[PDB]
Design an enzyme around this catalytic site. Structure first.
Site, PDB file in Angstrom:
ATOM      1  N   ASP A 158       0.808  -1.210   0.000  1.00 29.75           N
ATOM      2  CA  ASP A 158       0.000   0.000   0.000  1.00 29.75           C
ATOM      3  C   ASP A 158       0.857   1.283   0.000  1.00 29.75           C
ATOM      4  O   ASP A 158       0.552   2.260   0.703  1.00 29.75           O
ATOM      5  CB  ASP A 158      -1.051  -0.030   1.138  1.00 29.75           C
ATOM      6  CG  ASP A 158      -2.221   0.939   0.979  1.00 29.75           C
ATOM      7  OD1 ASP A 158      -2.308   1.614  -0.098  1.00 29.75           O
ATOM      8  OD2 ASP A 158      -3.046   1.041   1.933  1.00 29.75           O
ATOM      9  N   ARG A 162      -0.263   8.928   1.030  1.00 28.32           N
ATOM     10  CA  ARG A 162      -1.079   8.849   2.255  1.00 28.32           C
ATOM     11  C   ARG A 162      -0.374   7.975   3.325  1.00 28.32           C
ATOM     12  O   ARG A 162      -0.638   8.137   4.542  1.00 28.32           O
ATOM     13  CB  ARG A 162      -2.515   8.324   1.959  1.00 28.32           C
ATOM     14  CG  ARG A 162      -2.553   6.899   1.467  1.00 28.32           C
ATOM     15  CD  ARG A 162      -3.963   6.428   1.078  1.00 28.32           C
ATOM     16  NE  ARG A 162      -3.829   5.171   0.352  1.00 28.32           N
ATOM     17  CZ  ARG A 162      -3.771   5.086  -0.973  1.00 28.32           C
ATOM     18  NH1 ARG A 162      -3.912   6.176  -1.719  1.00 28.32           N
ATOM     19  NH2 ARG A 162      -3.549   3.915  -1.559  1.00 28.32           N
ATOM     20  N   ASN A 163       0.572   7.093   2.874  1.00 31.25           N
ATOM     21  CA  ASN A 163       1.363   6.208   3.757  1.00 31.25           C
ATOM     22  C   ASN A 163       2.819   6.615   3.887  1.00 31.25           C
ATOM     23  O   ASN A 163       3.667   5.782   4.198  1.00 31.25           O
ATOM     24  CB  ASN A 163       1.240   4.746   3.329  1.00 31.25           C
ATOM     25  CG  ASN A 163      -0.007   4.124   3.787  1.00 31.25           C
ATOM     26  OD1 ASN A 163      -0.508   4.414   4.877  1.00 31.25           O
ATOM     27  ND2 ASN A 163      -0.545   3.274   2.952  1.00 31.25           N
ATOM     28  N   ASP A 176       2.575   2.588   7.541  1.00 36.86           N
ATOM     29  CA  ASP A 176       1.395   1.861   7.064  1.00 36.86           C
ATOM     30  C   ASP A 176       0.275   2.105   8.063  1.00 36.86           C
ATOM     31  O   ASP A 176       0.285   1.496   9.117  1.00 36.86           O
ATOM     32  CB  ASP A 176       1.681   0.362   6.868  1.00 36.86           C
ATOM     33  CG  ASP A 176       0.693  -0.378   5.958  1.00 36.86           C
ATOM     34  OD1 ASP A 176      -0.401   0.149   5.711  1.00 36.86           O
ATOM     35  OD2 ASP A 176       1.027  -1.489   5.497  1.00 36.86           O
TER      36      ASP A 176
HETATM   37  C1  LIG Z   1       7.114  -5.110   5.418  1.00 40.27           C
HETATM   38  C2  LIG Z   1       6.010  -6.123   5.508  1.00 40.27           C
HETATM   39  C3  LIG Z   1       6.848  -3.798   5.279  1.00 40.27           C
HETATM   40  C4  LIG Z   1       6.302  -2.892   6.254  1.00 40.27           C
HETATM   41  N1  LIG Z   1       5.256  -3.254   6.958  1.00 40.27           N
HETATM   42  C5  LIG Z   1       4.745  -2.361   7.900  1.00 40.27           C
HETATM   43  C6  LIG Z   1       3.631  -2.759   8.645  1.00 40.27           C
HETATM   44  C7  LIG Z   1       3.083  -1.911   9.594  1.00 40.27           C
HETATM   45  C8  LIG Z   1       3.636  -0.653   9.814  1.00 40.27           C
HETATM   46  N2  LIG Z   1       3.036   0.166  10.797  1.00 40.27           N
HETATM   47  C9  LIG Z   1       3.057   1.505  10.940  1.00 40.27           C
HETATM   48  O1  LIG Z   1       3.666   2.277  10.204  1.00 40.27           O
HETATM   49  C10 LIG Z   1       2.240   1.990  12.122  1.00 40.27           C
HETATM   50  C11 LIG Z   1       1.924   3.461  12.155  1.00 40.27           C
HETATM   51  N3  LIG Z   1       1.617   4.047  10.985  1.00 40.27           N
HETATM   52  C12 LIG Z   1       1.333   5.355  10.983  1.00 40.27           C
HETATM   53  C13 LIG Z   1       1.345   6.111  12.132  1.00 40.27           C
HETATM   54  O2  LIG Z   1       1.035   7.462  12.108  1.00 40.27           O
HETATM   55  C14 LIG Z   1       1.951   8.392  12.577  1.00 40.27           C
HETATM   56  C15 LIG Z   1       3.199   8.122  13.092  1.00 40.27           C
HETATM   57  C16 LIG Z   1       3.980   9.194  13.504  1.00 40.27           C
HETATM   58  N4  LIG Z   1       3.612  10.464  13.451  1.00 40.27           N
HETATM   59  C17 LIG Z   1       2.370  10.747  12.937  1.00 40.27           C
HETATM   60  C18 LIG Z   1       1.970  12.102  12.871  1.00 40.27           C
HETATM   61  C19 LIG Z   1       0.730  12.417  12.359  1.00 40.27           C
HETATM   62  O3  LIG Z   1       0.278  13.704  12.258  1.00 40.27           O
HETATM   63  C20 LIG Z   1       1.058  14.744  12.883  1.00 40.27           C
HETATM   64  C21 LIG Z   1      -0.144  11.427  11.904  1.00 40.27           C
HETATM   65  C22 LIG Z   1       0.218  10.110  11.961  1.00 40.27           C
HETATM   66  C23 LIG Z   1       1.491   9.733  12.479  1.00 40.27           C
HETATM   67  C24 LIG Z   1       1.647   5.504  13.335  1.00 40.27           C
HETATM   68  C25 LIG Z   1       1.947   4.155  13.370  1.00 40.27           C
HETATM   69  O4  LIG Z   1       2.261   3.485  14.518  1.00 40.27           O
HETATM   70  C26 LIG Z   1       2.175   4.215  15.745  1.00 40.27           C
HETATM   71  C27 LIG Z   1       4.743  -0.248   9.077  1.00 40.27           C
HETATM   72  C28 LIG Z   1       5.304  -1.093   8.124  1.00 40.27           C
HETATM   73  C29 LIG Z   1       6.478  -0.669   7.325  1.00 40.27           C
HETATM   74  C30 LIG Z   1       6.121   0.457   6.370  1.00 40.27           C
HETATM   75  C31 LIG Z   1       7.662  -0.277   8.189  1.00 40.27           C
HETATM   76  O5  LIG Z   1       6.956  -1.679   6.363  1.00 40.27           O
END
Ligand SMILES: *C(C)CC1=Nc2ccc(NC(=O)Cc3ncc(Oc4ccnc5cc(OC)ccc45)cc3OC)cc2C(C)(C)O1
Length: 297
Positions: A158, A162-163, A176
């Protein structure tokens, strides 16, 4: 998938007490999960508080979503630190529902940032205008982060603006949102079978054969580049996802260059959209190609 997240180990070095977290505003939310801003006291050994982002499930979540959050935590733990990936700081797997704690990225997701910066964009001061130099840097950083994930046998599935998150010093971090995204109400996700999928970002082999590889992530990267150099526009503008859309992509229809993409970046997009996955560049090749363009600039 190349890796099995369930066979991945979980280091208890990540364990952080939830009573040391003060939850603030919701950063993102979906049907079953959410990302919440929080203050973590005693995360830094000197007793200084710090802002973190916490992913967790809502009471609306089922067993499937509970396993998914645990698998996500194992994957993040397995990856380790990288400058272009959202970095895991801690977790809570005891005394309540699973909490995944990462660093907080102050500018939020890249798509919203680009849309907010669209009107004050300058191709070539205090005002912090977005420039072509920034877009090239974001291209590079995302290809670097994706090259790292591919070396770790990760398939994102994905990859889209947006990610991608933006933090200090114009540093982009792949993330993600997954369950912490309202995919049911997001027009970028389309009903395909009994799944709600981001079809405009998916390679034809993923659409028609449900096959996800290193090469299908490269296709999505090509779409990401289009969003980046269109300053946050939705791909295939004015084209709804219907039978004609599927027919056209299968037949070789491809988007023309976004308004601000240099010809050398559009050349990367065209190769990312090759019908033959074996003809697509690798993220490593893309990194080398952009590095070259940045120097020559
Ligand atoms: C391999 C299979 C590849 C892969 N998988 C994977 C799976 C799950 C993740 N999880 C996350 O990234 C969890 C996550 N995502 C977004 C998030 O939002 C954030 C984080 C930080 N700061 C933010 C600030 C915002 O506004 C000011 C809004 C959102 C924010 C938080 C979060 O966990 C807390 C990741 C992966 C990856 C991509 C590493 O690769």
């Amino acid at each position: 998938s190349y890796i099995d997240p369930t066979q991945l180990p979980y280091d208890h070095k990540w364990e952080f007490p939830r009573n040391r977290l003060s939850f603030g505003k919701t950063l993102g939310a979906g049907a079953f999960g959410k990302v919440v801003e929080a203050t973590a006291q005693g995360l830094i050994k000197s007793d200084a508080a710090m802002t973190v982002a916490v992913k967790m499930l809502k009471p609306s979540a089922h067993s499937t979503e509970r396993e998914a959050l645990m698998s996500e935590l194992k994957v993040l733990s397995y990856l380790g630190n990288h400058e272009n990936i959202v970095n895991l700081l801690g977790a809570c797997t005891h005394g309540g529902p699973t909490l995944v704690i990462t660093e907080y990225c102050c500018y939020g997701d890249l798509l919203n940032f680009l849309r907010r910066k669209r009107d004050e964009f300058v191709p070539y001061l205090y005002k912090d205008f977005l420039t072509l130099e920034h877009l090239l840097s974001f291209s590079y950083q995302v290809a670097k982060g994706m090259a790292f994930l591919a070396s770790k046998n990760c398939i994102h599935r994905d990859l889209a603006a947006r990610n991608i998150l933006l933090t200090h010093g114009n540093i982009t971090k792949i993330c993600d949102f997954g369950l912490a995204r309202d995919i049911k109400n997001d027009s970028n996700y389309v009903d395909k079978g009994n799944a709600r999928l981001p079809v405009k970002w998916m390679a034809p082999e993923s659409i028609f054969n449900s096959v996800y590889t290193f090469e299908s992530d490269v296709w999505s990267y090509g779409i990401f580049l289009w969003e980046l150099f269109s300053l946050g526009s939705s791909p295939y503008p004015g084209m709804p996802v219907d039978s004609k859309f599927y027919k056209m992509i299968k037949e070789g229809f491809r988007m023309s260059s976004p308004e601000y993409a240099p010809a050398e970046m559009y050349d990367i997009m065209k190769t990312c959209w090759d019908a033959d996955p074996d003809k697509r560049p690798t993220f490593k090749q893309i990194v080398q190609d952009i590095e070259k363009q940045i120097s020559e600039s």
